[PDB]
Every structure is written in C-alpha cells, then in structure tokens.
Design a protein around this ligand. Structure first.
Ligand SMILES: NS(=O)(=O)c1ccc(NC(=S)Nc2ccc(F)cc2)cc1
Ligand code: NA
Ligand code: NA
Ligand SMILES: [Zn+2]
Length: 259
C-alpha cells in the first residue's frame, strides 16, 4: 500500500519512485504566466449547472477533505468551455497552506494563493469515474483560488463540520450543501491539459482555473489548519501545506477565455 503525503520524507519530491508519471509530459499543477496565455476565441461559453446537486458526505482521507456528491445521474454538471460533452460533479476538496502566503497548487505569475478549491467532474461518455481516469479527456477539474479577506458565507457550513472529521478516516453526513455558494462572480478562466495533482498522478484532466479568486476569512482558513493528517489517537500532524508545487509546462499552451 502506498504511503505518500506532504512531509519531508514522503512529499512531492518522492512521489516519482512509486508513481513514475510524476515526471511525465502533462503534469499538474503549473504556473500560469498571464503574459504568455493567449485568448482563444474558439472556446465555447462555460456552463456550470449545479441546481440539482445532491451532496452526501464529507470525508477526511488523510490528504484533504472531500465533499462527496451523488453522481448516479446528471444532477450537477460542467459543460462548454474547452469541453466536449458532459462532465458530472463527483466531489470537491481544497489544498491549503500553513501561512496565508502559500497553499495553492496552481500559481499566477508565480503568485501563491492561500488555498485552492478543486471541483472534480468526470466525462459521462466513459460511464464511471474509474474508467474516466484512464482516458486523456476523462476528468474536468474546476479550480478556484482562495485569498484571505472577507468571509465567504457559503463556505461556513463546511468550516463548521470540520471539528467532526478531525482525523484520517472520519466522515460525517453532509447533505443539502450548495456548491454554487463557492463560486466567484466571473467565470473567466484559463485552461490546459494536465493531471491529477496527487498520486496516482494520472494524465486525465482538462484543467479549468478561474481567474477571479474567492475571498474567505482568516478565521475560516484557520479552521482548515486544525485538521489532522493522522488518524485518531496518533501523534498530531496538522493538515497544512497539502499542495504540490508547480510542474514543468513542457509542450503545453495555456488558453484564456477572456481578452
Ligand atoms: N487534486 S486533483 O487533481 O483535483 C485530484 C482529483 C481527484 C483525485 N482522485 C480521486 S477523487 N480518486 C482516485 C482514486 C483512484 C485512482 F486510480 C484515481 C483517482 C485525486 C486528485
Ligand atoms: Na469559454
Ligand atoms: Na470573488
Ligand atoms: Zn485537488
């Protein structure tokens, strides 16, 4: 069984030994150089259709926490933009720092944000998530930066349940959560082909990274930082700095949806 994480001994610089694709040609995250990304008039309008989203549960997996959705039907889907066809929401999670000056996976002109939200969707032409991650167009991840400032009211229900899932393997019922409350006003975005940012690092993702960050309060992010990577009863290792740094861009171009 694998033992990867974010520490010195098991962090991103070690992942390649068990997961050689770590050094592949389309790894994520990347730095988004805003002066090299080009506006693409071919991109169709982005469609985020979350009205019928059905959240179920929140889980501390020892790496982050996942808010999981019922994806047994097209209840919450992402379409348009660079995407061909229909991508179903399965879960969201975050990456964050020990300090407000770090935490995001993607960077913007080398700027690190305090955190990054990933809304994970799978291409319904492949039938199930497990099949989709074996395809180069299997997933679409909508990435949203978080900066510290004013509180995000739509985040507070997530913050308040974290006390109940402090340690690895703990879960809690998490019904009726509306992920629309985590979006910024603008859907302007950058897009490029990449990968999962954790093991197994599969090169199956179309990344759609929104330009406009959301603002969360210091108190909200402080509560993320009280989570634990460890299991119950084990020595405490605070769940902080669960982000992979930027990877080589290699042959890829980042396209902008906006002028
Ligand atoms: N940070 S991320 O790139 O958005 C990201 C999104 C999703 C996942 N993996 C999930 S949900 N399960 C999974 C399990 C077994 C596999 F073989 C493959 C994937 C990891 C990272
Ligand atoms: Na677009
Ligand atoms: Na915003
Ligand atoms: Zn992620």
């Amino acid at each position: 069984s694998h033992h990867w994480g974010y520490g010195k001994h098991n962090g991103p610089e070690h992942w390649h030994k068990d997961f050689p694709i770590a050094k592949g040609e389309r790894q994520s995250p990347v730095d988004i150089d805003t002066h090299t990304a080009k506006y693409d008039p071919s991109l169709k309008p982005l469609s985020v259709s979350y009205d019928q989203a059905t959240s179920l549960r929140i889980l501390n997996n020892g790496h982050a926490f996942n808010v999981e959705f019922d994806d047994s039907q097209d209840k919450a889907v992402l379409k348009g933009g660079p995407l061909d066809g229909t991508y179903r929401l399965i879960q969201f999670h975050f990456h964050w720092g020990s300090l407000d000056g770090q935490g995001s996976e993607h960077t913007v002109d080398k700027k690190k944000y305090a955190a990054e939200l990933h809304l994970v969707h799978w291409n319904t032409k492949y039938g199930d998530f497990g099949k989709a991650v074996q395809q180069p167009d299997g997933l679409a991840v909508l990435g949203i930066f978080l900066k510290v400032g004013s509180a995000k009211p739509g985040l507070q229900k997530v913050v308040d349940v974290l006390d109940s899932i402090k340690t690895k393997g703990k879960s809690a019922d998490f019904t009726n959560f509306d992920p629309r409350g985590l979006l910024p006003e603008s859907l302007d975005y950058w897009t490029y082909p990449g990968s999962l940012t954790t093991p197994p690092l599969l090169e199956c993702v179309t990344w759609i990274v929104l330009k406009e960050p959301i603002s969360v309060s210091s108190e909200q992010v402080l509560k993320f930082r009280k989570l634990n990577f460890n299991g119950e009863g084990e020595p405490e290792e605070l769940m902080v700095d669960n982000w992979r740094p930027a990877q080589p861009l290699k042959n890829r171009q980042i396209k902008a949806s906006f002028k």
